[PDB]
């Protein structure tokens, strides 16, 4: 077919413990949240193992495509840059361990682990600011109305989440009833967006935000192979899809909303595009990539993937993976060249482990049990053929149009 020339993987970190267990998260259920074997927000050992399995699949796939030779690549061939978080650094390392076992590759990352990496969090870092009014306006435009619409749009998932929590028996519900309120989970509080004064943080609070977090946690519990997921009250693929639709909706609103996405994702989009075509001195190419670079692995977060998706108009649904930005899942950019006419193409795929592949820690390979690999259509691109190929020149213009120039690094 075509020749796979270069790949950039924007990977979410692997399975992690919840980053935060708020009073609200405790109060919305009478049940006890299962504890995790690692500190909050850290990649679990099982998370690492799953990422390594995924790295083995990547290795299998890229070698089958001739992009990697057999044997050990070097940093010249494969570069893994991770965010400063432990979860992303170890995800990058687990990726290298799986794609190149015994090859001594080491994940790279900003040396100062104490500060945000502006590649992964430019807004947090202060590279550019979100305007509160534009942010509220952009999110509502994205939603098609004010956040109060969410309780109607997601009434069934919200009710489902309330049932899974046994919200009606929760301390939060008794507090609501104390105040003469009903225990309508969808409306236990207002959905509020808060941009802090400096414009470096945007927060969603309220039922959607909480439900996004809780749904993700259930999925992480499930992905961790925990024995009790959601107190055994969450089973069935559609129920998983439905419940996680709250999470995906939250990520759509708070990370895919182009205004937000372009401010938070511009350095990553520029890093992805410049690494993909290997324009090593281009703006936004921040890494010491070798001219021989075949794979750039970016160890980031679900928000990063969603920001990129928002910037490029990417929308997907993953068979057997209700989280659109699943643990260890990678937004994979592939540079293809048609040997017959030398036309070059960009393909975007979401590589991911299904729920079962995660939960059962299944060995991934090409013939028996591949990772999921969902082609993703790009706004403004040719989206040609079943794999939604974009002509390279078209992809580069789309990237140039999607970036917020004030947000580059």
Numbering used by the authors: 10 to 418
What does the paper say about this structure?
The phytase APPA derived from Yersinia intermedia exhibits exceptional overall properties, including a high specific activity (3960 U/mg), excellent pH stability within the range of pH 2.5 to 10.0, and resistance to pepsin and trypsin digestion at 37 °C for 2 h, making it highly suitable for application in the feed industry. By hydrolyzing phytate—a compound that inhibits nutrient absorption found in animal feed—into inorganic phosphoric acid, it effectively reduces phosphorus excretion while enhancing mineral and protein digestion and absorption. However, the issue of heat resistance has emerged as a critical bottleneck hindering the industrial application of phytase due to the technical requirement of instantaneous high temperatures during feed pelletizing processes. The active site within the two domains typically consists of two conserved motifs: RHGXRXP in the N-terminal and HD in the C-terminal, with His and Asp serving as catalytic residues.
Among these variants, a clear increase in residual activity compared to that of APPA was observed for a variant with four mutations (APPA_Y51E/V86D/A323L/M359L, designated as APPAmut4). However, further verification through shaking flask fermentation revealed a progressive increase in expression levels of both APPA and APPAmut4 following induction, with the expression level of APPAmut4 surpassing that of APPA. The APPAmut4 exhibited optimal functionality at 55 °C, maintaining over half of its activity within the temperature range of 35 to 60 °C but becoming nearly inactive above 65 °C. Below 50 °C, the enzyme demonstrated stability; however, it experienced 45% decline in activity after a 2-min incubation and retained less than 10% activity following a 15-min incubation at 65 °C. Its half-life t1/2 value at 65 °C was approximately 3.4 min. Additionally, the T50 value was determined to be around 55.1 °C. The melting temperature, Tm, of the APPAmut4 (58.2 ± 0.9 °C), corresponding to the temperature at which a decrease in catalytic activity is observed, was found to be comparable to that of APPA (58.1 ± 0.9 °C). Therefore, we crystallized APPAmut4 (20 mg/ml) to determine its structural basis for the observed differences compared with the WT, resulting in crystals belonging to the orthorhombic space group P212121. B-factors analysis indicates that the α/β domain demonstrates relatively lower flexibility than the α-domain, particularly in the β-sheet region, suggesting a higher degree of rigidity. The N- and C-terminal regions, along with loop regions (residue 76–86, 119–128, 138–144, 235–246, 348–351, and 392–395), display flexibility which may negatively impact protein stability due to their limited interactions with other residues and disruption of noncovalent connections within complex networks.
